[PDB]
């Protein structure tokens, strides 16, 4: 019955003592942290506490969106040699770092994801030609569905794939997706593999990546400029922001201390130096 | 009144009993006792395999040695029990399964010996690899050493053999082999075998995963990390040694999807 925004217990008055009750002395080897308050070691006063842990609840700690990726698409001229650029991006929280580490304070989590889509666009060729406001379609291609090969193939028809139609110059695009995990919670660390290499099988036939599984395959996001070829090329970037609302977490882990190196837990040489210099006898 | 103490303990699982006189109580991970899979939480339809005493008893691994230059030691579960009597057999023949464990590490010395050992149970102890060229590159064989387990190192060594890479872990001790300061390791259920006080560490771990049951052959749910927090010294000698031993016992052992024998390539 203790809510997140409720006041923490008041610190009460305590005078002098001298007996056989031992608050100060314990043993950490047992694995238990001594749950002491100030009155156990010092003489304190009656104090009506007012502060609350309202701002540190799991909900509140993650109550923010974070740039997860930056996608790049364009609309060049018809006379072009290289094909119009369409972006494909696999849905992961692990391309960026900030959000990842927060998520990584825990081993498992349940949340409904809210995604926002900020879109930028610019001219690239130093000309004086013109472009007409663009519309961008962000289709969600789940694992299994056909992933576009052309900016103009049959996939972009979207009969069952969720797709967003964003007009440039308006409110950034935002959708919601429920807990879509194949497991009962999203796993942030997997201590295993996908395949089991068997004795009577070729090593090649039995290999898989360490810590890699379907637990994390959510398909890709495909985007293009709906507009047809324009005489003067226009570049555009869609910045995606993920907010894990309605969140639940399990098993606390120490936070990443060394800069990340790939989607795994691996680290590289010369990055393994997080702490600076500080002498033992100085403040 | 009767002299009952938290240092003196005896635990019994099956036809095996552990006894000690220098304990520091006992830890039950996250306050949860191991349990059987509930109907409300179940998923595979087939009637499950509950081996009981058959698999659920204490199992002693191969003893290792603690000296001044040891950097640490590690093991994974179930992995570290893969070849232990019935449990292992029951593991190799069923597609899925779940289990808890009571891990008991042993290491006594003298009132003249000193040192502290951090015994940490890390759910999903995904260790770091040895290559700076390719990530998540450690092979199954090297990942799962089984009962012998593995060790931590004090210096990162990137494999530069691009022809036939080593494909193993290179777990740096201070980063608890995962890229996170060992100092925070205490966030995980743990105990400290500080020679002065205690000779053992006992931790009870329930089954922990993102799902009710999983393929124990493909996935390790808990890791066992033991690192000397304080160094091992005795009197005034230069190279002292004290053995460390781990006995592990599954708890509430159950398995489903019985089929033919799994013969994995371990080497």
């Amino acid at each position, epitope marked *: 019955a203790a809510t997140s925004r409720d006041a923490l217990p008041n610190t009460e008055a305590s005078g002098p003592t001298h007996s056989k009750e031992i608050p100060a002395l314990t043993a950490v080897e047992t694995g238990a942290t001594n749950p002491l308050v100030p009155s156990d070691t010092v003489q304190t006063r009656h104090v009506v506490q007012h502060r609350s842990r309202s701002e540190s609840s799991i909900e509140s700690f993650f109550a923010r969106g974070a740039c997860v990726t930056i996608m790049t698409v364009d609309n060049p001229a018809s006379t072009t040699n290289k094909d119009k650029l369409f972006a494909v991006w696999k849905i992961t929280y692990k391309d960026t770092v900030q959000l990842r580490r927060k998520l990584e304070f825990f081993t498992y989590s349940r949340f409904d994801m809210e995604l926002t889509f900020v879109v930028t666009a610019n001219f690239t060729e130093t000309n004086n030609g013109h472009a007409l406001n663009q519309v961008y379609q962000i289709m969600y291609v789940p*694992p299994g569905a056909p992933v576009p090969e052309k900016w103009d193939d049959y996939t972009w028809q979207t009969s069952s794939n969720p797709s967003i139609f964003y007009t440039y110059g308006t409110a950034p695009a935002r959708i919601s997706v429920p807990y879509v995990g194949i497991s009962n919670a999203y796993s942030h660390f997997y201590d295993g593999f996908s395949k089991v290499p068997l004795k009577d099988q070729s090593a*090649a036939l039995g290999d*898989s*990546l360490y810590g890699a599984a379907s637990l994390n395959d959510f398909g890709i996001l495909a985007v293009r400029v709906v507009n047809d070829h324009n005489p003067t090329k226009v570049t555009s970037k869609i910045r995606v922001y993920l907010k894990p609302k309605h969140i639940r977490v399990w098993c606390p882990r120490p936070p990443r201390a060394v800069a990340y190196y790939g989607p795994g837990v691996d680290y590289k040489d010369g990055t393994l130096t997080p702490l600076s210099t500080k002498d033992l006898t100085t403040y | 009144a009767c002299g009952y103490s938290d240092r003196v303990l005896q635990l019994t699982l099956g036809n095996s009993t552990i006894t000690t006189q220098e304990a520091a109580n006992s830890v039950v991970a996250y306050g949860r006792w191991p349990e059987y899979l509930r109907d409300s939480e179940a998923n595979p339809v087939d009637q499950p395999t509950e081996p009981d005493v058959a698999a659920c008893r204490f199992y002693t691994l191969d003893t290792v040695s603690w000296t001044k230059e040891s950097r640490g030691w590690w093991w994974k579960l179930p992995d570290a029990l893969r070849d232990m009597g019935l449990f292992g057999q029951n593991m190799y023949y069923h597609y899925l399964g779940r289990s808890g464990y009571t891990v008991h590490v042993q290491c006594n010395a003298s009132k003249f010996h000193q040192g502290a050992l951090g015994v940490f149970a890390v759910p999903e102890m995904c260790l770091a690899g040895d290559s700076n060229t*390719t990530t998540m590159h450690t092979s199954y064989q090297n990942a799962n050493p089984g009962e012998k387990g593995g060790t931590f190192t004090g210096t990162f060594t990137p494999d530069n053999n691009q022809t036939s890479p080593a494909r193993r872990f290179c777990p740096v001790d201070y980063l608890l082999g995962n890229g996170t300061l060992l100092g925070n390791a205490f966030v995980f259920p743990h105990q400290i075998i500080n020679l002065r006080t205690n000779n053992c560490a006992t931790l009870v771990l329930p089954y922990v995963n993102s799902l009710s049951i999983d393929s124990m052959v493909k996935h390790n749910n808990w890791g066992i990390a033991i690192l000397p927090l304080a160094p091992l010294n005795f009197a005034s000698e230069s190279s002292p040694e004290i053995p460390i031993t781990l006995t592990i016992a599954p708890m509430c052992c159950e398995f489903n999807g019985l089929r033919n024998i799994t013969l994995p390539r371990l080497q």
Partner: nanobody, 128 residues
Framework: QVQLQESGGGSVQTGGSLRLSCAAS????????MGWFRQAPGKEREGVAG????????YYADSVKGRFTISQDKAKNTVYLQMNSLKPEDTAIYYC?????????????????????WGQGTQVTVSS
């Protein structure tokens, strides 16, 4: 699966050009870097070439760089492999390799590990 169907078994002499192709028409989580593996009956199976599904991440085995190149048709869907200046040391059975979720060939970059759909096999002999 995807479709993987390969051909091109021409026993050319030492120093000739050969082209290998593998179908990848259906679009599953499509062959990322793709993959080309040769099995020398003296040795075993080994990875060789590979260009990312969309991106220009093409990895080349130490033994084949420059001479062997990978490229495909992002439409006609088939994967080409230009193998020129052929040594007699490259006489082996080649195979194409679908590495699905692109990250499979981004993490490890090279194939082998993230590869689920296996090709048929074409015998290439480069002799005197």
């Amino acid at each position: 699966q995807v479709q993987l169907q390969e051909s091109g078994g021409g026993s050319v002499q030492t120093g000739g050009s050969l082209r290998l192709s593998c179908a990848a028409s259906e679009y599953t989580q499509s062959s990322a870097c793709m993959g080309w593996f040769r099995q020398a009956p003296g040795k075993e199976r080994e990875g060789v070439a590979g260009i990312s599904r969309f991106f220009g991440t093409a990895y080349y085995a130490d033994s084949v760089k420059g001479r062997f190149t990978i490229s495909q048709d992002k439409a006609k869907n088939t994967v080409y492999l230009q193998m020129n200046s052929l040594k007699p040391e490259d006489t082996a059975i080649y195979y194409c390799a679908a590495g699905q979720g692109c990250l499979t060939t981004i993490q490890a970059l090279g194939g082998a590990y993230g590869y689920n759909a296996w090709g048929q096999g074409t015998q290439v002999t480069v002799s005197s």
